[model samples]
Target: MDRKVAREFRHKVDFLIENDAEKDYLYDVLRMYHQTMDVAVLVGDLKLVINEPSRLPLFDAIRPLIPLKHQVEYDQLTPR
Candidate 1:
């Protein structure tokens, strides 16, 4: 790809990565607050289920950043 085009894509990728981290942080805090945690979680829990990490890609905040064409592919991978 041309340099200008490649640069533009990088900008978008960077923003998406930053947004994804922010989203993961906020969602965990909110979900933990709502769920009221367990002793395994130590005070308040983020749940943090090991098997559930893949579910992160399917979160609402991260979904919008995914290309619409590929969203269904990931959704199918997520357990119902």
Candidate 2:
């Protein structure tokens, strides 16, 4: 069923975020999830490149998924 595939898709995405994996890797994983599982990425575009910053909203659409906050937090640690 389509609903089951969607649930599995969400689980895979959550697992990636839980491990603090990079978004680039998420894109790759999602692509594989799409192909073999016949699950569509709800994001509007499938033609996106690996490093494109525009992929942010796609990452944001996943419910309760925490996006990376690496640099700004580290930058705050510097002496001002």
Candidate 3:
């Protein structure tokens, strides 16, 4: 749910500060996942799953920066 990027980078800059602790928590377990195939997490209550962490920052932050420009590409594979 907390995946969308703001219209401007400044927005996220402020957000990052506000949730500085959360960012630390996320990055903490991220490294654990990297070192071992099986890793557990402690996010207070729910489980945190990061299947692919390729390219890290750019991929995660800018992945949806362009929104969904093309329907066919966005939808993918399924027959029209």
Candidate 4:
């Protein structure tokens, strides 16, 4: 199931890249993807779980920053 989740995750990342979605939004998606995997590891569903606890807030935080490409780029360059 990890393989499936990874496949879907890669597909979504590729889709976002192809669509040129905001880098912040892309980062949020990736964050959620990783969180989901962690949860799945704990719960043993893999594909059954559709969401993670922090996903909505992450999306909310990322949504407004989507169009701010310069800010996103600058943020990515900084050490976290």
Which whole-number lDDT from 0 to 100 does residue 28 have in model 4? 52
lDDT of 2: 0.40
Task: Supply the global lDDT for candidate 4.
Answer: 0.39
Q: How well is each residue in 1-80 modelled by candidate 3, as lDDT tens digits?
A: 55446454335433443466645555565455446422222222113322223212222332243235422242342112
**lDDT scores for all predictions?**
0.43, 0.40, 0.35, 0.39
Which numbered prediction scores highest in TM-score against the true structure? 3
Lowest lDDT sum, 10 consecutive residues, model 4, at: 41-50
Residue pair clashes in candidate 1: none
Of 2 and 4, which scores higher on TM-score?
2
Candidate 4 global TM-score? 0.23
The regions of model 4 sitting more than 4 angstroms off are 1-3, 16-24, 28-80
**Ten consecutive residues with minimal summed lDDT in candidate 1?**
38-47
Better of 1 and 4 by lDDT: 1
What TM-score, computed on C-alpha atoms, does each candidate reach? 0.30, 0.24, 0.30, 0.23
Model 4 Cα lDDT, one tens digit per residue, 1-80? 24354455555545534444443455554466455633323222311221344232333333233345633543453222
Of the two candidates 2 and 3, the one with more favorable TM-score, higher being better, is 3
Q: Which pairs, if any, clash in model 4? A: none
Model 4 CA lDDT for position 8 = 53
Candidate 4, residue 29: the lDDT equals: 46
